[PDB]
Design a binder for this molecule. Structure first.
Ligand SMILES: N[C@H]1CO[C@H]2[C@@H]1OC[C@H]2OC(=O)Nc1cccc(F)c1
Ligand SMILES: N[C@H]1CO[C@H]2[C@@H]1OC[C@H]2OC(=O)Nc1cccc(F)c1
Length: 340
């Protein structure tokens, strides 16, 4: 590997560990913001577009109910998420600007990304051409090189978690399942269509599960649908562990070869997890036209720019029932969330 890549990753790890060992806490409060619109929801939390009252800047505020986090066994995962987000720094990761808690909730306030989900644009167009898919995939390869060098596993890659910014580049969001791992880890988590065989089989697993999920993502971007699907998760799991996959005839031979090596059921033979690491991917024939430095420096003109009117436009997100953000007059679950 070139010495400039080695020195870049060594400095990146030094800066991450300084923030990891001394996390920021309590850097705003709720009545510093005005609420604008709910951007979507979940079982234990929501994301809302908000405006900061002094500066006028827009942000995306993720709100988690402390009692529901405890009930759904997500305490350690919520603490991982905020500790990792406040310590990372890379061109294709969403930025955490503030965090705080109150009697009822935890809050993570991130920069707002007005182009919306990659998934929305994929379904509007049908499928991405191979040059368009390759522009997005190169950004994910560089982001995993960075996260894996910090001993982090991401564990939720899918098109709904990749937002498109005002220059047409990716911002990765949702670190709810991310974790710092030396060696192996064991938690069953993720989305069914994207799970590697070793997660389904309850084995001890490692960063190779993120390279499997990159194979699922590139297939989905280039075909318009993922490689393994069915009405019941147990049927999806049976197709994943089987060791077979069918490719559309319009795929190039170079694309098929790359996908057979990422969607490799034996984790000890999978690209990204061999002696040469990420360079088996960067040097594959499917990426021969990619300028890795130009992508990192954001100097390549993007294939597509989202249509929106300004920094507070919500037209690329969809519509949800608007509910209260209620805060109890008594403190809930204070012990469990002391470090947040
Ligand atoms: N389809 C699901 C999943 O994404 C949607 C919808 O529910 C929640 C929504 O999440 C967001 O808008 N998050 C978000 C995070 C950071 C910045 C930003 F601008 C938006
Ligand atoms: N969406 C996030 C990330 O890019 C924006 C925004 O936070 C502020 C900016 O920080 C960066 O450009 N970070 C960065 C730049 C060069 C090298 C590197 F390793 C990280």
């Amino acid at each position: 590997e070139q010495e400039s890549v080695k020195e870049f990753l060594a400095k990146a790890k030094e800066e991450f560990l300084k923030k990891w060992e001394s996390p920021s806490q309590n850097t705003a409060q709720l009545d510093h913001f005005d609420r604008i619109k709910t951007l979507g929801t979940g079982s234990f939390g929501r994301v809302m577009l908000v405006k900061h009252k002094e500066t006028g800047n827009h942000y995306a505020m993720k709100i988690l109910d402390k009692q529901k986090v405890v009930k759904l066994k997500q305490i350690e995962h919520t603490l991982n998420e905020k500790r990792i987000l406040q310590a990372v720094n890379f061109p294709f990761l969403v930025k955490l600007e503030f965090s705080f808690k109150d009697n009822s909730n935890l809050y993570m306030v991130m920069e707002y990304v007005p182009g919306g989900e990659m998934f929305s644009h994929l379904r509007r167009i049908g499928r991405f051409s191979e040059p368009h898919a390759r522009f997005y995939a190169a950004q994910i390869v560089l982001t995993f090189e960075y996260l894996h060098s910090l001993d982090l596993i991401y564990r939720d890659l899918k098109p709904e978690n990749l937002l498109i910014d005002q220059q047409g580049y990716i911002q990765v969001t949702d670190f709810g399942f991310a974790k710092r791992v030396k060696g192996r880890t064991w938690t069953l988590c993720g989305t069914p269509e994207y799970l590697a065989p070793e997660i389904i089989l309850s084995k001890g697993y490692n960063k190779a599960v993120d390279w499997w999920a990159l194979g699922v993502l590139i297939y989905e971007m280039a075909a318009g649908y993922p490689p393994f699907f069915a009405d019941q998760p147990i049927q999806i799991y049976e197709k994943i562990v089987s060791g077979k996959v069918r490719f559309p005839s319009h795929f190039s031979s170079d694309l098929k070869d790359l996908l057979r090596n990422l969607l490799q059921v034996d984790l000890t033979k999978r690209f990204g997890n061999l002696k040469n690491g990420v360079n088996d991917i960067k040097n594959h024939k499917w990426f021969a036209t990619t300028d890795w430095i130009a992508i990192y420096q954001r100097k390549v003109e993007a294939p597509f720019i989202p249509k929106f009117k300004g920094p507070g436009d919500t037209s690329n997100f969809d519509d949800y029932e608007e509910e209260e953000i209620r805060v109890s007059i008594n403190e809930k679950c204070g012990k469990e969330f002391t470090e947040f």
